[PDB]
Every structure is written in structure tokens, then in C-alpha cells.
Symmetry: C4
Subunit: 92 residues, 4 copies
């Protein structure tokens, strides 16, 4: 349960380091810092305005940006579901 929470934090950093590098120069408001990126990657992870607000505008410059976001969305959604079930196990 704690192993999952640690793994996510690790993944989230590598993701926000990568996103900064890839989209930072072109999209400074969302990916211009490691911190600006950590926030957007959290916003995308909760799914709030992920596509119409972030992904679609990013793709008008980087047409393959979906290769980054869609997996990140699937990965974090699986990690969160795995973390959600881990709490249920601790009960039973």
C-alpha cells in the first residue's frame, strides 16, 4: 500500500521532469517549471480539462503529445485504483 504511494511519487516526478523538457519552451504556463508541470500533471491526473484544456492545445504544436498523456492517464488511473484497493485489503 505504501510501496504504491512511493512508486507513484517517483513516476510523477519523472513525468513532470519529462513534460517540462518536452512542452516547457512552447507551453510555459503549464509546463515551464518542474513545479508548474507537477501541478498540470496532477490536474490531468484528476482528469479536469485534460483534453480540451491541455492535450488538444499541446497537440496543435506537438502532434504526438498524446503518446505522453494518454499512457500517463492510464498509468496513474491504474496506480490510483491499485492504491484504492490496497486500502480495502487493510480492512476486510
Amino acid at each position: 500500500v505504501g510501496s504504491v504511494a512511493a512508486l507513484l511519487t517517483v513516476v510523477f516526478y519523472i513525468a513532470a521532469v519529462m513534460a517540462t523538457n518536452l512542452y516547457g519552451a512552447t507551453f510555459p504556463e503549464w509546463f515551464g517549471d518542474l513545479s508548474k508541470s507537477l501541478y498540470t500533471l496532477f490536474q490531468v491526473m484528476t482528469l479536469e480539462s485534460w483534453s480540451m484544456g491541455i492535450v488538444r492545445p499541446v497537440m496543435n504544436v506537438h502532434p504526438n503529445a498524446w503518446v505522453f498523456f494518454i499512457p500517463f492517464i492510464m498509468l496513474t488511473a491504474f496506480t490510483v485504483l491499485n492504491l484504492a484497493i490496497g486500502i480495502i485489503v487493510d480492512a476486510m
Copy 2:
């Protein structure tokens, strides 16, 4: 568990093939080719701007478009919940 993941992929393709055909000519940005559709159907599946952003604009041209989207939303939401429970079973 793997059977569900395979079934969804099958359904998602038939859905994106259909969506391309039905709304492609009229809504090229979201359903203009097979991939454009696959992305929009994923966006609709995560629920991000599904109605105000996609479905409502599509219905101003195709007033019965809801017969396609609403079931797709219910189907994928059930398939995902079924896939979510399948992972819980593998634990126990």
C-alpha cells in the same frame, strides 16, 4: 480480466470506425480519421468535456447523436468497472 481488456479494445475500434463514418465529414477535428475518433472516444470515455465540448455541438447537426454517445459512455463505464473489479478478484 484479460478477456475484458481485449473486448474493450475490440468495442473501442468498432466505435471509432462508426464515429468516423457518422460524424467525420461534419466534425473533422474530432472524428476526421480513425485516430482522431479513437482519441475523441477516449476523451469522451474519461468523460472530459463529453457533453458541452463534444456531444452538444455534434447534436446541433446530428440531433440523434446521443443514441451513439450515451450508450458508449454507459458501456465503457460498465466495462471499466468490470475491469476494476477483476483486479480486486486477483488479490483477495
Copy 3:
């Protein structure tokens, strides 16, 4: 499990009959028919643009509209969670 699915359909109709009556004349695009209402109440139920898109604009005319929507959101979210768990029970 089937009892819950039946109860929701009943509730959804009474809700969409009520919403039509209350907000129909003032908000014809979202609540001007029983069908227009069934769609908005589904969109609100999935949570897509529920507040910034629907509830907040409705409250600029009907300032107590939240007494209708917030409970409907809580009720349907509980009914859906109850329906979600009912499927898990059928497995075990």
C-alpha cells in the same frame, strides 16, 4: 442489483419531470422538454460541466437551484456506487 437499476430510472424520470417544470421556461436549451431534461440530468450525473456549465448559470436566475442539483448529484452518486457494489457481490 436490478431493484437499484429500476429505482434509479424511476428517480431520474421524476427528476427530469421536475427540472422541466422548474427551469424549462427560463433555460429551454437544457430543460425545455422532458427529453432535453433527461439528457442534462444525465450530463450533470456524470458530473461533466455540472456547475460552471449548468448549475451556476441556472442560479443567476433561480438562486436556490442548488437545493435541486446538489442532492440529485449526491443521490445518483450513491445509487451508482450502490449499483457498482451490487455487481461485486454477484462475483465473490
Copy 4:
């Protein structure tokens, strides 16, 4: 199960009292009084337009506003998941 529902209500009030104080004067439409805040904190809790619609505009004035919202989002999401599992326990 009832203990969780009580705890959330307590937390939600302290959060809405705080939000009113912190962002009230600057953002009167969303945090202008205790109720305006209670509604916005519920809207943020369901995740509807939490970032692009609320948090990002608030940060253009209060750049550390994320220290309030992101934890509130994580806290309520955990409290709700804990409340969701509590209902499953009552079945079994």
C-alpha cells in the same frame, strides 16, 4: 461509516470558513460568503472545473493557493473512498 460522514461535514465547514477568509475579498463570486465557499468547495470536491475554472484563476492573485486546494482535493477524495468502502463492509 457514520463517523466518516460526520468528520467530512466538520472538515468541509473549517475548509469553507478558511476559503471565505483567504479568497473571499478577491474572489467574491466563488468565496464571497460562507455558503458561496461551501458550494465552490463542493464543486472542487466533485472535481468539476477545479483547476482551469477555479484554482488557476485564484493563483493569478494568490500564487500559493494550490497549498489549500490540492490537499483539500486529496483529503476529500480519500474521505469519500473511505466512505465508499465503509458501505461495502456493511454488506459482505
